[PDB]
Design a protein around this ligand. Structure first.
Ligand SMILES: O=[N+]([O-])c1ccc2nn[nH]c2c1
Length: 297
């Protein structure tokens, strides 16, 4: 059975998966994605290192491949990460001038979003902008542009493609008692009150064993920021316990603004702790069956 079809029948938009050309050309990834997932996200092909490895010299081959594959197979598409401190070319981090970096960041956002205009359901505009204590991570963007880099990124993205849902995403938003979760909520509330177009908070849900339970409280907390949408993304779970996976699914089911869930790959050997839903033989694991059973009605 298809977790995407079943979650849609529960009123959600999609059950998605991260992938890219190297997965879709090998093994059973394409067949599993065709059958079981309604949205694809690029594991790497839309990050800054892949798409703009030297300034103004864009490489769209991998991103084009994924977008084309998705359209041919009837899948929704997400993109990202537009602004991130990891996988960032040295030519970017070497910039110390505010105007220069602002213009570079805007051009990077606008170029990618314009190329795929109208084809992308949601973009991860800014990723991993928070320290664990809830302060803002001191990246080149923060240090050179200042705190306005987040407003600027979102305003630029909205102008480039107003069809897309614009997300901020972060990890360790899995417990309501951890400072980072309330901190991003507070800053997103404030940004939106200032007119910044943040449509979504995406929770990069990389769990250890037993951490699914806390998501039942953390995801409603994220939704209290008042964004149009929240989502689970890059989901994986060390040990792949059905209990942890079912808890995350139920958290999304319980939150009206949660639009869907994306799992961080297909088969365990291709994971970034056997933490995915398909084994090395590309067979569904107990956690996959448990999600199916939970979503059936
Ligand atoms: O939901 N995802 O797994 C996922 C993977 C790669 C991404 N890049 N930007 N957003 C992403 C989400």
């Amino acid at each position: 059975q298809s977790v995407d079809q079943l979650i849609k029948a529960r009123g959600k938009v999609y059950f998605g998966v991260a992938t890219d050309q190297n997965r879709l050309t090998t093994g059973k990834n394409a067949a599993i994605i065709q059958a079981d997932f309604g949205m694809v996200w690029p594991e790497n092909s839309m990050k800054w290192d892949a798409t703009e490895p030297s300034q103004g010299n864009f490489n769209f081959a991998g991103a084009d491949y994924l977008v084309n594959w998705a359209q041919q197979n009837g899948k929704l598409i997400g993109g990202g990460m537009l602004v991130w401190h990891s996988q960032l070319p040295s030519w970017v981090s070497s910039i110390t001038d505010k105007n220069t970096l602002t213009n570079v960041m805007k051009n990077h956002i606008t170029t990618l979003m314009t190329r795929y205009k109208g084809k992308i359901r949601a973009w991860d505009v800014v990723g991993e902008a928070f320290n664990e204590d809830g302060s803002l991570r001191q990246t080149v963007f923060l240090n050179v542009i200042g705190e306005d880099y987040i407003p600027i990124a979102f305003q630029t993205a909205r102008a480039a493609d107003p069809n897309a849902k614009l997300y901020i995403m972060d990890y360790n938003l899995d417990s309501a008692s951890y400072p980072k979760t309330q901190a991003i909520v507070n800053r997103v509330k404030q940004w939106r009150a200032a007119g910044v177009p943040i449509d979504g908070i995406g929770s990069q849900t990389h769990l250890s064993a037993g951490q699914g339970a806390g998501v039942l409280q953390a995801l409603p907390l994220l939704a209290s920021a008042g964004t149009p949408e929240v989502s689970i993304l890059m989901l994986d779970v060390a040990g792949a316990s059905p209990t942890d996976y079912v808890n995350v699914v139920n958290a999304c089911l319980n939150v009206q603004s949660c639009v869907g869930i994306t799992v961080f790959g297909v088969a365990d050997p291709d994971s970034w702790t056997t933490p995915l839903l398909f084994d090395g033989n590309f067979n569904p694991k107990p956690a996959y069956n448990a999600i199916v059973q939970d979503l059936q009605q």
